[PDB]
Design a protein around this motif. Sequence first.
Motif, PDB file in Angstrom:
ATOM      1  N   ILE A 124       0.578  -1.221   0.365  1.00 42.38           N
ATOM      2  CA  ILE A 124       0.626   0.123   0.145  1.00 42.38           C
ATOM      3  C   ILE A 124       0.464   1.222   0.145  1.00 42.38           C
ATOM      4  O   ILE A 124       1.302   1.130   0.679  1.00 42.38           O
ATOM      5  N   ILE A 125       0.218   2.291  -0.831  1.00 41.16           N
ATOM      6  CA  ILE A 125       1.367   3.228  -0.876  1.00 41.16           C
ATOM      7  C   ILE A 125       0.701   4.766  -0.406  1.00 41.16           C
ATOM      8  O   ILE A 125      -0.564   4.557  -1.337  1.00 41.16           O
ATOM      9  N   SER A 135      -5.038   6.451  -1.761  1.00 39.41           N
ATOM     10  CA  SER A 135      -3.903   5.328  -1.163  1.00 39.41           C
ATOM     11  C   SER A 135      -3.992   4.489  -2.688  1.00 39.41           C
ATOM     12  O   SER A 135      -5.241   4.491  -3.659  1.00 39.41           O
ATOM     13  N   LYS A 136      -2.839   3.476  -3.097  1.00 40.61           N
ATOM     14  CA  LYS A 136      -2.736   3.309  -4.350  1.00 40.61           C
ATOM     15  C   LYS A 136      -2.287   1.012  -3.439  1.00 40.61           C
ATOM     16  O   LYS A 136      -1.495   1.388  -3.418  1.00 40.61           O
ATOM     17  N   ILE A 137      -2.376   0.215  -3.974  1.00 41.39           N
ATOM     18  CA  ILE A 137      -2.412  -0.749  -3.622  1.00 41.39           C
ATOM     19  C   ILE A 137      -1.412  -1.043  -5.274  1.00 41.39           C
ATOM     20  O   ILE A 137      -1.876  -1.655  -6.326  1.00 41.39           O
ATOM     21  N   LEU A 138      -0.398  -1.593  -5.226  1.00 39.81           N
ATOM     22  CA  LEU A 138       0.819  -2.089  -5.685  1.00 39.81           C
ATOM     23  C   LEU A 138       0.727  -3.495  -5.554  1.00 39.81           C
ATOM     24  O   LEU A 138      -0.382  -4.244  -4.843  1.00 39.81           O
ATOM     25  N   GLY A 139       0.849  -4.170  -7.111  1.00 45.25           N
ATOM     26  CA  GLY A 139       0.318  -5.469  -7.167  1.00 45.25           C
ATOM     27  C   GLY A 139       1.385  -5.928  -9.248  1.00 45.25           C
ATOM     28  O   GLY A 139       2.356  -4.918  -9.495  1.00 45.25           O
ATOM     29  N   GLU A 140       1.291  -6.823  -9.373  1.00 47.46           N
ATOM     30  CA  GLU A 140       1.110  -6.754 -11.211  1.00 47.46           C
ATOM     31  C   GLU A 140       0.885  -5.898 -11.453  1.00 47.46           C
ATOM     32  O   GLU A 140       0.529  -6.069 -12.330  1.00 47.46           O
ATOM     33  N   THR A 141       2.338  -5.461 -12.800  1.00 48.51           N
ATOM     34  CA  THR A 141       1.644  -4.430 -13.163  1.00 48.51           C
ATOM     35  C   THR A 141       1.664  -4.032 -14.723  1.00 48.51           C
ATOM     36  O   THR A 141       2.068  -5.984 -15.317  1.00 48.51           O
ATOM     37  N   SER A 142       1.040  -3.424 -15.197  1.00 46.10           N
ATOM     38  CA  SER A 142       1.102  -3.577 -16.234  1.00 46.10           C
ATOM     39  C   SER A 142       2.728  -3.645 -17.392  1.00 46.10           C
ATOM     40  O   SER A 142       2.822  -3.690 -18.489  1.00 46.10           O
TER      41      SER A 142
END
Lengths: 284, 284
Positions: free
Chosen positions: B117-118, B146-153
């Motif tokens: 999380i950011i 806020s922004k959930i990090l994950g598998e990016t494009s």
Amino acid sequence: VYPKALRDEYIMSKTLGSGAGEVKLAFERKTCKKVAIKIISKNVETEIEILKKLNHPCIIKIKNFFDAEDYYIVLELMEGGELFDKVVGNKRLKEATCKLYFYQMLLAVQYLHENGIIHRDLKPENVLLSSQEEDCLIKITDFGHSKILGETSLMRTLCGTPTYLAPEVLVSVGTAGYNRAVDCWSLGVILFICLSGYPPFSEHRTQVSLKDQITSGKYNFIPEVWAEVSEKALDLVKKLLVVDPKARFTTEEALRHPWLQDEDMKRKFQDLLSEENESTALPQ
Amino acid sequence: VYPKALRDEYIMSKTLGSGAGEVKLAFERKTCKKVAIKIISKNVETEIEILKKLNHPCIIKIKNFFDAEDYYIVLELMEGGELFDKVVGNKRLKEATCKLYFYQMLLAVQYLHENGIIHRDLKPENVLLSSQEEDCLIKITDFGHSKILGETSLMRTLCGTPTYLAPEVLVSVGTAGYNRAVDCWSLGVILFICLSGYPPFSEHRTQVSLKDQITSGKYNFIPEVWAEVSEKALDLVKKLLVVDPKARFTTEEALRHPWLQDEDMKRKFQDLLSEENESTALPQ
Ligand SMILES: C/C(=N\NC(=N)NO)c1ccc(NC(=O)c2cc3cccc([N+](=O)[O-])c3[nH]2)cc1
Ligand SMILES: C/C(=N\NC(=N)NO)c1ccc(NC(=O)c2cc3cccc([N+](=O)[O-])c3[nH]2)cc1
């Protein structure tokens, strides 16, 4: 087995293509007409949503969708197959055929960009041909990597005072809103391959890494293959393969290029549209 | 009026704060205890989802949520109010109080970053104090940006051959995965304000635009305010206000800085945690 709801409306038949993905021939029971069914092994529902909203003759339409098991997407049959097969093994299209195909890809991509969609996976595998004749309609397919533009997180951030805002966010302001330019770069690569029969960036017979070829924009020019290709065609290619996304040609600027001011080609396109269209009586 | 489901469990009372947003005092009927209710005028459900998963003593917990009308979020009461009020009007905290508060913000943000999380909106308005005493627990609030990090494009793109991939995507590879560093920059700005009573980047008495101050990293140093602040504290501030996100201190590196190797402060924090904790008997 196939799902019951699919079998209810369609009879399945032979394989047409085998991606990574499978495409099958089927017949719609109600009409006895041929359709194509894309099977994807299980944002596919989002790809469906995107494709239900879109209405352009050079973009694939969804006729139906089933979520099993796997995903099954029913669409219009494109008897001509993928553009990929017409350009593999250094086969190349006549210059007039590229212009016809390319004009259609530009209109398709233009329409996407006006409607806030970036495709992000344009390549000859994702371009389909309406018939086995060289002069035909093409349709763009495969919206699995596509992206809906909208109100960005960047825009919301810049409404407040940047007292607490990091420098990299402010620097990204200079180049934001140019994500769509990746589609124009891809079109440039596709055009190159179509006109020449070979890819511009490749590891074949080089020591420059693929990455370094692409970020410098130094495409592989082989003078003796291009000799028979006009200057205007090459000039358009060069304005699409520009490394700075802000200076790169948009779909609009490519449609106004001298190479696409060819009234024979446009008439040949308009007449193909009429051939496809069979619908209702009009007033008058 | 308030929604029926809320009125069913809580009795509403006076206003505590008035954002842009409103926070009210309420009593939980079942227990007769004070709670705070954040009212947001109608990704708030996503903010709720994020905040239901999180479990750290320096991060706000949700006790309840109702979606009317408007959104109502019930939480633990933080009688001390916002950190903002302790630093407005050039008021400043003692250096020992900043260290206590700052240590807590680092642990909170560290825990967010470990959990993908950011926050993206760290500021003194979003830091809450557990009591009116200077030595207290703080909690970070407001996960609306806020922004959930994950598998990016980006990661999915780099699995194929980049034959068709635009140069700007390949160049972005050098600096991707550093989005979290915006939280570390914000912490740096908060620390500065806490130690000094004034903001580092501001339009007060300057001709350098706010944007130019931030992207050059040239904070407003006024030697006579900092005279009474240690060198170690200033040194940490300087490693957080570094313009290159890749060279900027992470939460880990800030927790290992000489300024936070203060065993008095850590004990004062551990004892505050015990004061807060009232729960069950243990074996043994
Ligand atoms: C929407 C889509 N893919 N979406 C996706 N997420 N893929 O991963 C999609 C991808 C590919 C196709 N391909 C065809 O319809 C298609 C391929 C093909 C090959 C030979 C012959 C025919 N044909 O209809 O004669 C063909 N049709 C159709 C749809
Ligand atoms: C989750 C959240 N906001 N989320 C959001 N999307 N905002 O736009 C949120 C934002 C702010 C707060 N604030 C408080 O709980 C809060 C503010 C305040 C002021 C004086 C006194 C007290 N108090 O509990 O004594 C206060 N509590 C609580 C929650």
